[PDB]
């Protein structure tokens, strides 16, 4: 027959018969390269701990969405506040000293 | 000199550190725990095994009647029957013909066979970890065994070691144990008195020569049908015997953390867990003045190849200029890079091999040379082979583990975000300043 068993990093003991016991360790052979591309860190750090990589990764997916959409707010709220406050009001004028410096 | 420590309870692993004195040269520290015994208070509460159901002669006062008596042994049962008129090889065995009255007799003992097939009942308390040592200082190897409470200060010439509490408090056994020719079980055995028939512990005494045997075997007397004398009883089957059809796989297996379960005394040897604050107050004779020991002058740590895994898969090589021969301890300044070596030879101009072993994926620690911290930069490739045969000597870390080429894409894409938020940030200030201005 054959059967499988998992390893971690803390060990495992088996007996097979009258056997002295035989312990086995696992070390941290992942699949790809953590010094390679991203892609191959991801695949590596995956296979190690996917749980943590999961949550890293949707940690910087959060913060390059909230901050893209944070700094993109700031910039449109000023350029709102720079175009309507005289800029937009009606039968005014606004030359290019004062439009061109920020708008469009 | 007073060095408080935190040694991995891991049987066999070396645990390296380096204790400065000022004005004194480095002393190389190593301690190993040799072995480790988890000792229980014990208390035995009875025996038990096979019951021998002992059935005396019957008794036929058999023209009149019987009176059935109160007696010491185990599981006394008694019967008087009505009239019975038995036979044996002989043909009638009294006179009257239903005036027969027959007595029943049916007891316990203890079989012949349970000085060897036998089981011990025990309640164990709170277990004590004791340790063995192997403290290397100098060149000066000191054995010696100390209790882990904290207090105790086991000792074997004059290093006066105190084994600080253990950080986790384990105990492989339950409180209540059964050992049965060296096998150990965790059982909740009926306390002394409270027999079960057919359950383990249904006859109980406080040892196999104990004349106070207590026991509860369901024996039931039956009315004789037969003519010939017999006395027929039906019983509940051996406790002892069913338990061991249901015990289970022992404790010797089913154990955490990697025991050994012993027996005489009941022990639980090698076990894997937690952390001892180790004190160690060193004799002053062994330090030496920092003037006898060599002077570094300069050194530089180059690292060959280097891979992450349980053994010394790692190599160092470093050039040093010492103005005198004599030997160095050498340390890493790190937590997950330990090295093979504790002294070496340095003869002027140089360059000697240090093996390390890492969790982390970066030759990123310092060394020392008696002295002179170097630090090492390389990249350290995850190991091919996938199983070994022996315990990882370093823990895993976080800051360790993670890689320098993630941590910047990491920094890139959380600082690319905070300063995306700060030039929004200064915008907005700037903004509204000129709309202030504005009105």
Same mark, same amino acid.
């Given at each position: !027959?054959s059967? =499988?068993?998992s390893?971690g990093?803390?060990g495992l003991?088996?007996?097979?018969?009258?056997?002295?016991?035989?312990?086995?360790?696992?070390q941290?052979?992942?699949?790809?390269?953590?010094?390679?591309?991203?892609?191959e860190?991801?695949?590596?750090y995956?296979?190690?701990?996917?749980?943590?990589?999961?949550?890293?990764?949707?940690?910087?997916?959060?913060?390059?969405?909230?901050?893209?959409?944070?700094?993109?707010?700031?910039?449109?709220?000023?350029?709102?506040?720079?175009?309507?406050?005289?800029?937009?009001?009606? =039968?005014?004028?606004?030359?290019?000293?004062?439009?061109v410096?920020?708008?469009? | 000199? %007073?060095?408080?420590?935190?040694?991995?309870?891991?049987?066999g692993?070396?645990?390296?550190?380096?204790?400065?004195?000022?004005?004194?040269?480095?002393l190389?520290?190593?301690?190993?725990?040799?072995?480790?015994?988890?000792?229980?208070?014990?208390?035995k509460?009875?025996?038990?095994?096979?019951?021998?159901?002992?059935?005396?002669?019957?008794?036929?006062?058999?023209?009149?009647?019987?009176?059935?008596?109160? $007696?010491?042994?185990?599981?006394?049962?008694?019967?008087?029957?009505?009239?019975?008129?038995?036979?044996?090889?002989?043909?009638?065995?009294?006179?009257?013909d $239903?005036?027969? +009255?027959?007595?029943?007799?049916?007891?316990?003992?203890?079989?012949?066979?349970? !000085?060897?097939?036998?089981?011990?009942?025990?309640?164990?308390?709170?277990?004590?970890?004791?340790?063995?040592?192997?403290?290397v200082?100098?060149?000066?190897?000191?054995?010696?065994?100390?209790?882990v409470?904290?207090?105790?200060?086991?000792?074997?010439?004059?290093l006066?070691?105190?084994?600080?509490?253990?950080?986790?408090?384990?105990?492989?056994?339950?409180?209540?144990?059964?050992?049965?020719?060296?096998?150990?079980?965790?059982?909740?055995f009926?306390?002394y008195g409270?027999?079960?028939p057919?359950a383990?512990?249904?006859?109980?005494?406080?040892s196999?020569?104990?004349?106070?045997?207590?026991?509860?075997?369901?024996?039931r007397?039956?009315?004789?049908?037969?003519?010939?004398?017999?006395?027929?009883?039906?019983?509940?089957?051996?406790?002892? %015997?069913?338990?061991?059809? =249901? $015990?289970?796989? @022992?404790?010797?297996?089913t154990?955490?953390?990697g025991?050994?379960i012993?027996?005489?005394?009941?022990?639980?040897?090698?076990?894997?867990?937690?952390?001892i604050?180790?004190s160690?107050?060193?004799?002053?004779?062994?330090?030496?003045?920092?003037?006898?020991? @060599?002077?570094?002058?300069?050194?530089? #740590? +180059?690292?060959?190849?280097?891979?992450?895994s349980?053994?010394?898969?790692?190599?160092?090589?470093?050039?040093?200029?010492?103005?005198?021969?004599?030997?160095?301890?050498?340390?890493?300044?790190?937590?997950?890079?330990?090295?093979?070596?504790?002294?070496?030879h340095?003869?002027?101009?140089?360059?000697?091999?240090?093996?390390?072993?890492?969790?982390?994926?970066?030759?990123?620690?310092?060394?020392?040379?008696?002295?002179?911290?170097? +630090?090492?930069?390389?990249? #350290?490739?995850?190991?091919?082979?996938?199983?070994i045969?022996?315990?990882?000597?370093?823990?895993?870390?976080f800051?360790?583990?993670?890689?320098?080429?993630?941590?910047?894409?990491?920094?890139?894409?959380?600082?690319?975000?905070?300063?995306?938020?700060?030039?929004?940030?200064?915008?907005?200030?700037?903004?509204?300043?000129?709309?202030? !201005?504005?009105?």
């Amino acid at each position: !027959t054959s059967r =499988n068993f998992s390893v971690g990093r803390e060990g495992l003991e088996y007996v097979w018969g009258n056997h002295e016991p035989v312990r086995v360790w696992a070390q941290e052979s992942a699949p790809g390269d953590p010094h390679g591309w991203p892609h191959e860190i991801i695949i590596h750090y995956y296979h190690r701990h996917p749980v943590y990589t999961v949550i890293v990764l949707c940690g910087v997916a959060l913060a390059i969405l909230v901050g893209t959409a944070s700094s993109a707010a700031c910039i449109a709220k000023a350029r709102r506040d720079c175009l309507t406050p005289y800029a937009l009001a009606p =039968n005014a004028t606004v030359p290019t000293a004062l439009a061109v410096l920020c708008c469009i | 000199f %007073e060095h408080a420590t935190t040694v991995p309870n891991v049987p066999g692993i070396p645990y390296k550190a380096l204790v400065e004195r000022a004005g004194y040269a480095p002393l190389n520290l190593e301690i190993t725990v040799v072995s480790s015994e988890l000792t229980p208070s014990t208390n035995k509460e009875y025996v038990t095994c096979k019951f021998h159901t002992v059935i005396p002669s019957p008794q036929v006062k058999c023209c009149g009647s019987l009176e059935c008596k109160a $007696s010491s042994k185990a599981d006394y049962t008694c019967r008087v029957f009505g009239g019975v008129y038995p036979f044996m090889w002989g043909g009638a065995q009294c006179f009257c013909d $239903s005036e027969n +009255t027959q007595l029943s007799e049916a007891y316990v003992e203890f079989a012949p066979d349970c !000085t060897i097939d036998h089981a011990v009942a025990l309640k164990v308390h709170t277990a004590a970890l004791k340790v063995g040592l192997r403290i290397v200082y100098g060149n000066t190897t000191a054995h010696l065994d100390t209790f882990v409470n904290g207090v105790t200060p086991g000792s074997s010439r004059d290093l006066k070691v105190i084994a600080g509490p253990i950080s986790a408090a384990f105990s492989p056994f339950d409180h209540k144990v059964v050992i049965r020719k060296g096998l150990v079980y965790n059982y909740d055995f009926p306390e002394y008195g409270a027999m079960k028939p057919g359950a383990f512990g249904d006859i109980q005494a406080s040892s196999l020569y104990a004349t106070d045997i207590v026991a509860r075997t369901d024996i039931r007397l039956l009315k004789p049908s037969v003519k010939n004398i017999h006395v027929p009883y039906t019983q509940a089957v051996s406790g002892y %015997e069913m338990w061991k059809n =249901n $015990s289970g796989r @022992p404790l010797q297996e089913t154990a955490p953390f990697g025991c050994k379960i012993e027996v005489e005394p009941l022990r639980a040897s090698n076990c894997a867990y937690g952390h001892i604050p180790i004190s160690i107050d060193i004799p002053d004779a062994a330090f030496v003045r920092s003037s006898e020991s @060599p002077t570094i002058l300069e050194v530089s #740590c +180059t690292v060959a190849d280097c891979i992450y895994s349980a053994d010394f898969g790692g190599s160092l090589t470093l050039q040093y200029k010492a103005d005198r021969e004599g030997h160095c301890p050498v340390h890493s300044h790190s937590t997950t890079a330990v090295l093979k070596e504790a002294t070496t030879h340095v003869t002027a101009t140089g360059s000697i091999t240090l093996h390390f072993s890492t969790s982390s994926p970066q030759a990123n620690f310092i060394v020392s040379l008696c002295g002179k911290k170097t +630090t090492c930069n390389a990249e #350290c490739k995850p190991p091919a082979d996938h199983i070994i045969g022996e315990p990882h000597k370093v823990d895993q870390e976080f800051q360790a583990a993670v890689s320098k080429t993630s941590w910047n894409w990491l920094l890139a894409l959380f600082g690319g975000a905070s300063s995306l938020i700060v030039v929004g940030l200064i915008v907005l200030v700037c903004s509204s300043m000129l709309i202030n !201005t504005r009105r």
